[PDB]
Paper text:
Altogether CD38 appears to be a key player in the biosynthesis of calcium messengers which are involved in a wide range of cellular functions. Thus, the catalytic transformation of NAD+ involves the formation, via a ribooxocarbenium ion-like transition state, of a unique reaction intermediate that partitions between several competing pathways such as an irreversible hydrolytic process leading to ADP-ribose and a reversible minor pathway that governs the formation of cADPR. The L-shaped structure of bCD38 consists of two distinct domains separated by a cleft and connected by a hinge region. α-Helices are found mainly in the N-terminal and membrane-proximal domain of this transmembrane protein, whereas β-sheets are preponderant in the distal C-terminal domain. The active site of bCD38 consists in a funnel-shaped cavity with a fairly rigid structure; it buries the NMN+ moiety of the substrate and its scissile bond in its deepest non-polar and least solvent accessible region, whereas the AMP moiety interacts with its more solvent-exposed region, at the entrance of the catalytic cleft.
Next we replaced NAD+ with 2′-deoxy-2′-β-D-fluororibofuranoside NAD+ (rFNAD), a close (bioisosteric) structural analog carrying a fluorine atom at position 2′ of the ribose moiety linked to nicotinamide (N-ribose). Using this strategy, we were able to trap a non-covalent complex between the E218Q mutant and rFNAD and its structure was solved at 1.94 Å. Despite the presence of two CD38 molecules in the asymmetric unit of E218Q mutant of bCD38, the structure of the non-covalent complex with rFNAD revealed that only one site is fully occupied; it is possible that one of the monomer and active site are rendered less accessible and/or reactive due to crystalline packing constraints. In particular the ribose from the adenosine part is well-resolved in density. This NAD+ analog is constrained by the enzyme in a somewhat folded conformation and is stabilized in the active site by extensive interactions. The electron density maps show that the nicotinamide ring of rFNAD is buried in the active site in agreement with the experimental observation that the cleavage of the nicotinamide-ribosyl bond is the first step of catalysis. Thus, the N7 atom of its carboxamide group is hydrogen bonded to Oε1 of the carboxylate group of Glu138 (d = 2.7 Å) and Asp147 (at a suboptimal distance = 3.3 Å). Upon formation of the Michaelis complex, this hydration network is disrupted and displaced by the binding of the N-ribose moiety of the ligand. As shown in Figure 4A in the rFNAD/E218Q complex the 2′-deoxy-2′-fluororibose linked to nicotinamide is fixed in the active site through efficient hydrogen bonds between its 3′-OH group, which displaces a bound water molecule, and the Oε1 atom of the mutant residue Gln218 (d = 2.7 Å) and backbone NH group of Trp118 (d = 2.9 Å).
Numbering used by the authors:
A (entry chain A): 40 to 277
B (entry chain B): 39 to 275
The structure:
């Protein structure tokens, strides 16, 4: 197919419904009950048969309202450029990243796109964010989910950043661009800049990029505590 | 066209929306960054103009709510039902926030609006009454959409000001009842303040039908509940 991105995950619909069952029954049973058939149907309806490069935030409002990415106060974890580590940290400390919310869990690691005049997914290729269009259903999903995740944050939240990069805070990242500026006001944020096993840090809490982050948080009336110069192992020990 | 049961659209609706948006974003609650009030007003108009006033859906307000979500800091939220004036004077004095203190709630408070298919203008003549005409009207749908997100957004300790004075301080069919209470997140703690007129005595209290009503809803959602009754209008304020 013509897009520069990999095609939709095979059997997407089955995966998201089975993941929904597993999540609602065995991961976060609670609660209030949710219909996973309805959630799957809402997920498909958001993007199926639509122009794969005209995704808007508004296409996802209904899906999100069925299961907002809300995490109990003091359990929320943000991350940027630290995928593996942040999730290991969350899993071990019993915390929740975006990928641990119902909708994040459904979509984590999946790919999807549709095609006008078709009720099927495009399993051949999907729009690439850089080569094709930013406004694609995969990228917009994560942007909008990220935004609501940031909005619903409460009490103490933590963020895991990459101390082996020149700028641990990337203002063009999803964290920098969508999450930090939408963080609920008056929450408290603790940041951990963590470096490879490995090697001396390339960024710190005193670096320019973190000062940029503090400036955004000052604006959101968010108290900020930053810790750095820790290796992955040292971090996971504290 | 004057066929509906409800008062027509507020005259100057568009001007009023723009003025209030400027006031809110510049003088009341300046944000950490700017919101484009022209864009907000355009989105508000586009939601309903030239549409069947009885075919409103929540989706019609997606763009608008995305421009200005009615969310606020934990512990800040004041809910109300049948206690508008009291609740708002309460909120003001304690520097808390009702829905009407959010950007969109502030824009829309006390206004009416509806359109008519094939017309680019508001219907100044009449608009659908939510009882006598249709529930799916742009005025009722707006408040339900806003109310739901505001309730969703609540965290830590939040409060609701009830009246009674009424045989049922908690009306299960009010917006608070259908839409707010049932959308509070688990572990949120709701304080209910049953305030009678003062005024001769009450009519309802933290014991009654109406509450086993509310409390029941909170239970089963995992919302903690504190009910303070036997309070007057002067005590409370
Ligand atoms: N500012 C407002 O006009 C407003 C309207 C509706 C709802 N709210 C939000 O919900 C709560 C109050 O609504 P309520 O229905 O619990 O309280 P009432 O005093 O019973 O009603 C307030 C106004 O809403 C109207 N109302 C109630 N149900 C509907 C409906 N289904 N459709 C249109 N209007 C309705 C009602 O007639 C009254 O003028 C309050 O916490 C606030 F957050 C605000
Ligand atoms: C900080 O960022 C770097 C760059 O992304 C990460 O290193 C990559 O990690 C992946 C996943 O293990 C490897 O497959 C790549 O080979 C690595 N790329 C490079 C350029 O080294 C690193 O894991 C991050 N560090 C922390 C502490 O999260
Ligand atoms: C409880 O409900 C009653 C009835 O709505 C409220 O009384 C009204 O208040 C307004 C504003 O002062 C008056 O103009 C109306 O005449 C009143 N209506 C009736 C039927 O009395 C009363 O304000 C509410 N009490 C509290 C504590 O909010």
């Amino acid at each position: 197919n013509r897009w520069h991105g990999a095609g939709s995950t095979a059997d997407f619909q089955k995966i998201i419904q089975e993941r929904c069952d597993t999540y609602t029954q065995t991961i976060r049973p609670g609660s209030r009950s949710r219909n996973c058939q309805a959630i799957r149907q809402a997920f498909m309806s958001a993007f199926i048969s639509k122009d794969p490069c005209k995704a808007t935030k508004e296409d996802y409002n209904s899906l999100i309202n069925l299961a907002p990415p809300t995490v109990p106060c003091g359990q929320q974890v943000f991350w940027s450029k630290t995928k593996e580590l942040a999730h290991e940290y969350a899993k071990r400390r019993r915390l929740m990243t975006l990928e641990d919310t119902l909708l994040g869990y459904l979509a984590d690691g999946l790919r999807w796109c549709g095609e006008p005049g078709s009720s099927d997914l495009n399993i051949w290729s999907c729009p690439d964010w850089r080569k094709d269009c930013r406004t694609n259903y995969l990228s917009v999903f994560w942007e909008v989910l990220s935004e609501r995740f940031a909005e619903s944050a409460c009490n103490t939240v933590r963020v895991v950043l990459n101390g082996s990069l020149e700028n641990a805070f990337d203002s063009m990242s999803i964290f920098g661009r969508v999450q930090a500026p939408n963080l609920r006001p008056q929450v408290e944020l603790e940041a951990w800049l963590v470096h490879d096993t490995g090697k001396p840090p390339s960024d710190s809490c005193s670096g320019s990029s973190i000062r940029k982050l503090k400036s955004i948080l000052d604006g959101r009336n968010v108290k900020f505590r930053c810790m750095d110069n820790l290796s992955r192992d040292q971090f996971l020990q504290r």
